């Protein structure tokens, strides 16, 4: 199987 | 090098109870060791941990698509990854190796310390007990505590302070999830 990444989000600029 | 350092750190935790029956997802954002915003699947929205994280909690909470990505994470991320690694993580079992050797609390005096070395085992949970002539000895026991070797194995030393008399048989007894009957090692004075 393939590990899934939790995709981080960019903070407020 | 005395230049100031600046560290941005983020974790996402998947907590499993009773296999995958109950799962909690926790996303955390840190700056210089200070956690400033998090998403807790118990809540289902971002919450500022400190004032510095409030702009992002508000910003991310305004993005419904991002929120629903996170709300599904217990399924699409936690339960998924649990299944992926289950065979070599959750089901990983390595039997402990048990040996006993004598030592000293004081170099100039006689051997008065029996060391039960329990090593190379996985998972971490372990129970070690000392017996003298088939009777459990709870007094004078000291340990390293559980030592992680950083390589998917653990060890511990469990020591009994005692004055061995001739004919005495000491037993180290070890319980661990890899066995359904205790491992024992005897040491004779």
């Amino acid at each position: 199987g393939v590990y899934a990444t939790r995709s981080s989000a960019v903070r407020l600029r | 090098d005395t230049r100031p350092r600046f560290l941005e750190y983020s974790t996402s935790e998947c907590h499993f109870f009773n296999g995958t029956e109950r799962v909690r997802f926790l996303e955390r954002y840190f700056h210089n060791q200070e956690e400033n915003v998090r998403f807790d699947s118990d809540v289902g929205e971002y919450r500022a941990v400190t004032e510095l994280g409030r702009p992002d909690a508000e910003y991310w909470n305004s993005q419904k698509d991002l929120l629903e990505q996170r709300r599904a994470a217990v399924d699409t991320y936690c339960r998924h990854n649990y299944g992926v690694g289950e065979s070599f993580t959750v089901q990983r079992r390595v039997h402990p190796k048990v040996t006993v050797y004598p030592s000293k609390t004081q170099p100039l005096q006689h051997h008065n310390l029996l060391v039960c070395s329990v090593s190379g085992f996985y998972p971490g949970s372990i129970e070690v007990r000392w017996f003298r002539n088939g009777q459990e000895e709870k007094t004078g026991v000291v340990s390293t505590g559980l030592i992680h070797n950083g390589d998917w194995t653990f060890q511990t030393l469990v020591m009994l302070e005692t004055v061995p008399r001739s004919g005495e048989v000491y037993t180290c007894q070890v319980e661990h999830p890899s066995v359904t009957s205790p491992l024992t090692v005897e040491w004779r004075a």
């Binding site: - | 350092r5 750190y9 065979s87």
Partner: protein, 180 residues
């Protein structure tokens, strides 16, 4: 809880160092080699049972880098406070003369995740067969790290793990020699 899986990632300035890793109950499953852009499994056999798209890690690191710039401005360029590590040297198993063993140097409870570690044999730097981990997460958001040195136990040889960290005034040496 029964188990915890943690994905942990960071980006650090001005070093421009980044790391992405997965943790299972305190052990590393894998990390991503940023240079080679490849998944590095903690135990070789893991790679036969599972896989990972390293590009997802690289993407997260770029986000971490962007978030760092944003946070550094917001905090008015407040620098991280150095927390010096605790260091422990131990062996993989009880020591027997002329029986192959492994020295373990456990570096714990520190930040930032930057350290210089040297194994010393009789005061001399040794690199033969040494290995190490990346920076591992803690529940208190400080870091852990392991270094390893295979060796043949003898009565003539003494060892030290020497650890340098910005939170330390001088290098920290932890000693090992044969217990008699």
């Amino acid at each position: 809880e029964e188990h915890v899986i943690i994905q942990a990632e960071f980006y650090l300035n001005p070093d421009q160092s980044g790391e992405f890793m997965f943790d299972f109950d305190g052990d590393e499953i894998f990390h991503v080699d940023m240079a080679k852009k490849e998944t590095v499994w903690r135990l070789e056999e893991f790679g036969r049972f599972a896989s990972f798209e390293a590009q997802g890690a690289l993407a997260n690191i770029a986000v971490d880098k962007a978030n760092l710039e944003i946070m550094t401005k917001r905090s008015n360029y407040t620098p991280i406070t150095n927390v010096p590590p605790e260091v422990t040297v131990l062996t993989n198993s009880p020591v027997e003369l002329r029986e192959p063993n492994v020295l373990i140097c456990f570096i714990d409870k520190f930040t930032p995740p930057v350290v210089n570690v040297t194994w010393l044999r009789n005061g001399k730097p040794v690199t033969t067969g040494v290995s190490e981990t990346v920076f591992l997460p803690r529940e208190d958001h400080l870091f852990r790290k392991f270094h390893y040195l295979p060796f043949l136990p003898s009565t003539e040889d003494v060892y030290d793990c020497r650890v340098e960290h910005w939170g330390l005034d001088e290098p920290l040496l932890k000693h090992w020699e044969f217990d008699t």
